[PDB]
Motif scaffolding. Sequence first.
Motif: not given
Length: 479
Positions: A335-337, A371-376
């Motif tokens: 989902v993130r990519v 930039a990074f796609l975080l998951g928090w």
Amino acid sequence: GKTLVYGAEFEDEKLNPILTEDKYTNEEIFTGLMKFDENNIPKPEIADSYTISDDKLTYDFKLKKGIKFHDETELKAEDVVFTLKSILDEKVNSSLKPEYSEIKDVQAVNDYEVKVILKEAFPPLLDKLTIGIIPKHCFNGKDINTAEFNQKPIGTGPFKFVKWDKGNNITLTKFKDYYGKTGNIEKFVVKFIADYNVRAMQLQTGEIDVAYLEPSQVSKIEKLNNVKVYKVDTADYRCMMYNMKKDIWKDVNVRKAFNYALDRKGMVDGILLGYGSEAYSPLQINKFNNPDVEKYSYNLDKSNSLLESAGWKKGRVKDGKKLEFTLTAPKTDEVRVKMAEYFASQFKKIGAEVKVDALDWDAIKIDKCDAFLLGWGSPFDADDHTFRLFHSSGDNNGSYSNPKVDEALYKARTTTDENERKKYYAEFQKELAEDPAYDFGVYLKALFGVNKRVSGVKEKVLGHHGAGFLWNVEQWNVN
Ligand SMILES: [Cl-]
């Protein structure tokens, strides 16, 4: 009532409540002085009573007598003191140490009475003290990092450890001497299946009972006569990390512009297919959420009408530096990519050339990426996933630093009156809207395919990737 099989998408590293923050098999083998209930509220578990002093610095616990580990050894205050002091031990170097470092000392004034002393007032202390207690005697001749305990754990949970086949399964069975009242399942096997297609067929054949489902496969698991699909709200969110080390984002109007260039509801339908909600707050699902902060309402024209004043123009350039960066998004969370693919392609309409990289976690360093796609996001106290994420800093990796956000998060972390804790958390969210650290995306919905023979599931707000969906398996029922 026989066996329940769980098809987990991630395999455990160590089976120790400390050294690990994941809510994997540790949640079935260990329990702590507290435990989150149906409403994500820490209630006494190993301890039967507790009281706090008038300064709020001393948490006077009293332990239930006769709590036995898996090896039939009685739990005393030694083990509770051992577990909490080994976190703050500088040599153990735990990942959870900064999350417990406001503790001055943990004292044992009685075999069944523990005292926890803080540095300053910390209301969400009882949230953190739900950590599992380990037996101290299993570590004397060992060093805790590489001990055999991490391979064969011993705890106070309703399911004792039995067997672990690396890359395959972890075996547990019902702990008969467990203090909590329990359902009927006698065996719990956690199969490590990373490919969500195998989980779907193993749910179809019935080889597994539960499985975390990706949004794309719910339409088929729905048609399964032997599987029920659980769609429950979580606090897990995805976003884009603005690395403050990059001068491309030192102007806040650039970040506000990039936040304006996202169709988050179109992302709820494109990637989540409605199983989610547009994200705008670091504590959106939390009770301390600020409903009226500045959300960036997909304003394609405002993003293009903020960069040129910020200096960026073509049709992309300011002072010859050409406005381009690289967005990092790890795999095994496809989902993130897909979000990163949607992030970069939607930032093309504002004149930005982003290079999306789908890499492995053992090759990514977040503080080095543009930039990074975080998951928090966490469904517990509002200090859990905020202080260590939006401060001078825990592991705040976006180098974000706001002086009013630092103070607002510190007061709410240190003040007792929860009504005023709302106030500080409301001012922090408002300041975070105008000075964004992240580019928020969507809030996720946990999707689990559970066999129709399973009972006892009670929904609540979940954590990372559905952390805590099976929080009450010791009361679930087979047949
Ligand atoms: Cl992450």
